[PDB]
Each structure stands twice: as structure tokens, then as C-alpha cells.
């Protein structure tokens, strides 16, 4: 319910538009709007836990960009990350974005 | 920045206006913040003084009341005439007041 | 720079302060932030005595007025220093 660490996708505001009536294309009088109210659309955030240089790293990422985490782990083979903290490993992965 | 004073203590001025118009006299004091000069023996007033240490017997003393600086006119020590004031740069070159009629210095 | 003469401002001139001279208790106006330990050093440095006791008290300024204008005198601090047996502060013996 927040922000994708890979894409930056975040909650957006969208209207909820309740409608009545038969559309004109079906031969009806037309659609009438019986209510418009704000709501939020959330990114499909999920957890992704990966091992990187012997350390466990967790990403909060939209389902759309789950493979983008694994690509980062691949490209992390050309880095020197041994002995680093997970917080420090995570910053190094995201720098490759 | 500073009050402009065409006259100073203590050159000799003609009093050209007011009840003492025509009097020539020396400038005892200049009060820039009032734009006023005191001229010897001009503009005399009768001030009451209380019986006191400074004035035993009390009664009245005589004060010189200030004159508005514009009422007064320097008298040129060279040609002895009342004059407007010009400015002249010497060779230093400091600047001095000079008589508008002739050209003598007023200092 | 901080010297003994920035800590000790003036003698306290009153019948209560004078009554203390006979015992070697001398009363000064001191800087309001000045500590008991530093008044001791300041008095010893300035008056060539040995302070064995220091009492202090704040003296709040009096509110005062000149017509329309209500104000306050500045706050002050008093110090009573006890000199070693036999010693004197001749500058205050004055009287």
C-alpha cells in the first residue's frame, strides 16, 4: 500500500463513476451518472526476498517489476559486496537502476 | 547626511530680515538641528529666572534667541559686503567658501 | 578576556552590608552568572585576602515607570564573602 522501490509507482487517485441506463449504442436513451467519488488505486506491491553476497535483501516492489529485481541481482555479480550490511547492499543494487 | 550651513561660528554676518534687519554681528553659535544661528547682540529676549543659587535676587536675564539660518548673510572680510557664498577648490585641493561679490576667502 | 574585575562590579553600600565588616563579611554586586567558586578566586585575586566562605543571592530588578513607560531595573546578584581570620579588605573599610 505504498511505493515501488524499483519503478516509483505510487497510489493514484481515480474517480469511481456509478452509471445507470442503457447506452445509446444499444438503442437506449443514454447513460446517466448516479455518483462520482474519489478513491485510490494502489500499485500491486509485493515482497521479494533475495540472497545477495550471502545476505538476505527484501524489496517492496510492484508485481510488474518483480523481474527487475532479479536483473539487478544478476548485474550485482560484477560488484564487490562481501562484508557489506544489507542496507548497504540494497543501496548498491538500486544504484544500478 | 549633514545639515548644510552657509555660515559658521564665528564669522561676521548681516541680519537681512526680521526686526533686527540690517544688524551686523558675530555668530556666537550654530545649531544645525534647529537650522539656526546665534548672533551677538541680536534677537534679545527677557527670560524670567527664579531666585536660586545660579540667580540670586531672581528677576530677569537677557538671552540671545536663535535666528533662522536663512535670515543671515556672511560679510566678506575682503570687500566688506554681504554676499552669497561660492565654493572654490584650492591647489591641495581642499575647498573653501569665497565671496560671490569679489572673490575673497571667507574661510 | 575574563578577569577578576569583570566578576566584581561594585561594593554594596547599605547599613546591612556595613554591619558585616566587623566580622570580615564583605558584600559586592557580582556578575549575575558568576559562580561561588569563581567569586572566591576573583576576590582573592583583586583584594589579596583568603576567602573561606561565599554566600550569594539574586536581587531582582524593581519595576519602575516614567509616566506612560513601564519598565524594570536590571537584575543583580549579591555576594557575601568571608575572609580568613585576621584579614581585612581595606578598600571597603572605607567606609
Amino acid at each position: 500500500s505504498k511505493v515501488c522501490e524499483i519503478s516509483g509507482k505510487r497510489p493514484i487517485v481515480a474517480n469511481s463513476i456509478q452509471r445507470r441506463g442503457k447506452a445509446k449504442r444499444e438503442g437506449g436513451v443514454g447513460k446517466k451518472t448516479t455518483g462520482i467519488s474519489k478513491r485510490r488505486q494502489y500499485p500491486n506491491l509485493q515482497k521479494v526476498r533475495v540472497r545477495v553476497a550471502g545476505q538476505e535483501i527484501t524489496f517492496r516492489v510492484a508485481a510488474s517489476h518483480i523481474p527487475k529485481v532479479y536483473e539487478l541481482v544478476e548485474r550485482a555479480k560484477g560488484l564487490k559486496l562481501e562484508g557489506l550490511s544489507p542496507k548497504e547492499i540494497k543501496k548498491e543494487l538500486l544504484k544500478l537502476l | 547626511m549633514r545639515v548644510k550651513m552657509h555660515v559658521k561660528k564665528g564669522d561676521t554676518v548681516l541680519v537681512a530680515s526680521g526686526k533686527y534687519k540690517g544688524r551686523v554681528g558675530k555668530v556666537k553659535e550654530v545649531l544645525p538641528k534647529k537650522y539656526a544661528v546665534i548672533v551677538e547682540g541680536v534677537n534679545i529676549v527677557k527670560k524670567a529666572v527664579r531666585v536660586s543659587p545660579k540667580y540670586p535676587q531672581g528677576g530677569f536675564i537677557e538671552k540671545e534667541a536663535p535666528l533662522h539660518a536663512s535670515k543671515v548673510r556672511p560679510i566678506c572680510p575682503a570687500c566688506g559686503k554681504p554676499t552669497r557664498v561660492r565654493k572654490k577648490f584650492l591647489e591641495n585641493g581642499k575647498k573653501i567658501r569665497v565671496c560671490a561679490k569679489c572673490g575673497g576667502a571667507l574661510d | 578576556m575574563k578577569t577578576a574585575y569583570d566578576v566584581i562590579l561594585a561594593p554594596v553600600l547599605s547599613e546591612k552590608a556595613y554591619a558585616g565588616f566587623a566580622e570580615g563579611k564583605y558584600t559586592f554586586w557580582v556578575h549575575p552568572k558568576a559562580t561561588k567558586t569563581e567569586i572566591k578566586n576573583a576576590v582573592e585575586t583583586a583584594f589579596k585576602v583568603k576567602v573561606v566562605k561565599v554566600n550569594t543571592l539574586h536581587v531582582r530588578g524593581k519595576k519602575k515607570r516614567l509616566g506612560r513607560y513601564l519598565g524594570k531595573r536590571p537584575d543583580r546578584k549579591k555576594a557575601i564573602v568571608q575572609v580568613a581570620p585576621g584579614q581585612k579588605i581595606e578598600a571597603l573599610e572605607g567606609l
Binding site: - | - | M1, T3, Y5, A91
Partner: protein
């Protein structure tokens, strides 16, 4: 004090070392307290001497600060 005396004070002060300047400040702050004590018992008619001494002390501290900024 007089203008000539001030120039003279600054010239002499600018030839003293920091240690000598501190000892002079310390002595002038001593004399300043003396003036305070005298003023406080109504025995200092020449009260201008207080202001002059406070500004002497300020000039000395100014010179002492000159010599230690380099």
C-alpha cells in the same frame, strides 16, 4: 580622550606582544573597577574617565585580536 592620545595608544599597543597586551588589559580592567567604586560613592567628578578607559580596553583587545588572527 584626545585624538592624539588615541593614535599614540594604538601605536604603542601595536608594538606590544600578546602577553604584554593581556597584562595591560588586566591592569586597565583593574583601574576600571577602581573608577566604579569611586563613582559609586560619589567621589568621581571626572566621570568621563570611565568611558575613556572602557574604550582603551576595547582598543587593546582589538589589537590583541589583530595579532592572533594571523
Amino acid at each position: 580622550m584626545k585624538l592624539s592620545e588615541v593614535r599614540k595608544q594604538l601605536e604603542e599597543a601595536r608594538k606590544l606582544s600578546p602577553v604584554e597586551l593581556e597584562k595591560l588589559v588586566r591592569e586597565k580592567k583593574r583601574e576600571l573597577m577602581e573608577l566604579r567604586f569611586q563613582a559609586s560613592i560619589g567621589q568621581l567628578s571626572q566621570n568621563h574617565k570611565i568611558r575613556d578607559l572602557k574604550r582603551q580596553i576595547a582598543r587593546l583587545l582589538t589589537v590583541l585580536n589583530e595579532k592572533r588572527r594571523q
